Design a binder for this molecule. Structure first.
Ligand code: HEM
Ligand SMILES: [Fe+2]
Length: 434
């Protein structure tokens, strides 16, 4: 036989620990660490997950070559979402020189989103931010003209796509279950929306964006090179990594601000003061806004949108006396690691001061403060994501005041899917400032 790695307790349901991973993934990953240590395992259906935690194990995880731990085929639930379509058999839109423009675009999207708010009212954070980020992502990554042809429908269907990521995907992403069925219908709904837009552009051409370019590409015969399914597949793929992440992070940032009015007041004074120089959001969102940035960092430590990072071992490796065999699913968890007691004093408390100049607990714990991951695969959209949070709230916090419309403890995440979403209701009251 072979040496067995430590295995966390429980996991006696039909698919081992899968059932528990769906109902309470963080509790399960935490128990793995509490019982096994830096290297423990749990069963996800027919796959064994080697969960790593702590600086040393995380370092190995984040510094391993794309040839040692494969990120491909690690997230089987994504295949049906992107589709088989192939256009060209992130980088561009994310170049620094483009940031200024995106910041201006984001400010515009926010103002348009709150345009009808009036003096006072209420909103649900998930509905608001999920939709807002569809508009920010599509406008910045695909084009403003394209976004102007999008409405709440695109948002709703994209949400359905994200919800079609049940852990059962590790059994088979095409299992005949409701969430997967809705997933497929939603994607077809998305393709139809794009097809309608394409037809509208054919009928009355511009007097141009990415869609216009793609629409104009043709094969020999003269027939259009790309179908609506292929283009949609690409657009979906381009917006996925930054949607649910920015959406959730935006909601939690506001939630923590309302939960901690002293930090909220600090941020307000800061914003009012900084923008007193008369420079635009496109200027300030790309520069230092310390109080808000520290609130964001702490929000990300406590509420990382990706609670688990997956890889597929392509060989045999040794991590702290433990053997990883090729074929094993190897994982790291920002959820668990970001709260390691030793690395972050009072890990369960919201303390943006951790990131202040003299403390910088984020830079000090290079292998455990991992909301954006680390190493070679560190989130490439990190700078954009931070800029977006800066731009969104520079507008929101200066225009309106926000208060929780439900118990502070009632705001929570839904972890029933691999793609974490804020749970509803998430009711918040707003009222114009000044
Ligand atoms: C503040 C919100 C965000 C958080 C917390 C976040 C977090 C992460 C994490 C933890 C990873 C690593 C996954 C792994 O190691 O397997 C990642 C990867 C990635 N993220 Fe984000 N992200 C955010 C926003 C965004 C945005 C807005 C974009 C696009 C504009 C984006 C694009 C990407 C891409 C393309 C990757 C893959 C990098 C690679 O493997 O080369 N992210 N992100
Ligand atoms: Fe509400």
């Amino acid at each position: 036989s072979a040496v067995a790695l430590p295995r966390v307790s429980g996991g006696h349901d039909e698919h081992g620990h899968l059932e528990e991973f769906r109902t309470d993934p963080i509790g399960l990953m935490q128990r793995v660490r509490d019982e096994c240590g830096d290297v423990g395992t749990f069963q996800l259906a027919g796959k064994q997950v080697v969960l790593l935690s702590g600086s040393h194990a995380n370092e190995f995880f984040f510094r391993a070559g794309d040839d040692d731990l494969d990120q491909a085929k690690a997230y089987p639930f994504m295949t049906p979402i992107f589709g088989e379509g192939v256009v060209f058999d992130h980088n561009a839109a994310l170049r620094g020189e483009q940031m200024k423009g995106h910041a201006a675009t984001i400010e515009d999207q926010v103002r348009r989103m709150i345009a009808d708010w009036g003096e006072a009212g209420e909103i649900d954070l998930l509905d608001f931010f999920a939709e807002l980020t569809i508009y920010t992502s599509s406008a910045c990554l695909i084009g403003k003209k394209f976004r102007d042809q999008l409405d709440g429908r695109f948002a709703k269907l994209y949400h359905e796509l994200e919800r079609g990521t049940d852990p059962l995907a590790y059994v088979d992403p095409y299992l005949p279950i409701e969430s997967f069925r809705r997933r497929d219908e939603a994607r077809n709904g998305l393709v139809a929306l794009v097809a309608d837009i394409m037809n509208g552009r054919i009928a009355n051409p511009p007097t141009r964006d990415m869609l216009d370019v793609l629409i104009a590409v043709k094969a020999e015969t003269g027939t259009p090179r790309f179908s609506a399914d292929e283009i949609t597949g690409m657009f979906i793929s381009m917006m996925f990594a930054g949607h649910h992440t920015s959406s959730g992070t935006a909601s939690w940032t506001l939630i923590e601000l309302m939960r901690h009015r002293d930090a909220y007041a600090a941020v307000i004074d800061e914003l009012d003061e900084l923008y007193g120089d008369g420079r635009s959001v496109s200027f300030h969102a790309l520069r230092q806004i310390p109080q808000l940035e520290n609130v964001l960092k702490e929000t990300l430590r406590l509420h990382p949108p990706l609670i688990i990072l997956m890889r597929v071992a392509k060989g045999e490796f040794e991590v702290q006396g433990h053997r990883i065999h090729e074929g094993d699913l190897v994982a790291a968890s920002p959820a668990i690691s970001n709260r390691i007691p030793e690395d972050f004093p009072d890990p369960h408390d919201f303390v943006p001061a951790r990131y202040e100049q003299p403390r910088q607990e984020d830079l000090l714990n290079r292998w455990t403060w991992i909301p954006f991951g680390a190493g070679r695969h560190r989130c490439v959209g990190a700078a954009f994501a931070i800029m977006q949070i800066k731009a969104i709230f520079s507008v929101l916090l200066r225009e309106y005041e926000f208060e929780m419309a439900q118990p502070p403890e009632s705001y929570r995440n839904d972890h029933s899917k691999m793609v974490v979403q804020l749970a509803q209701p998430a009711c918040v009251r707003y009222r114009r400032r000044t």
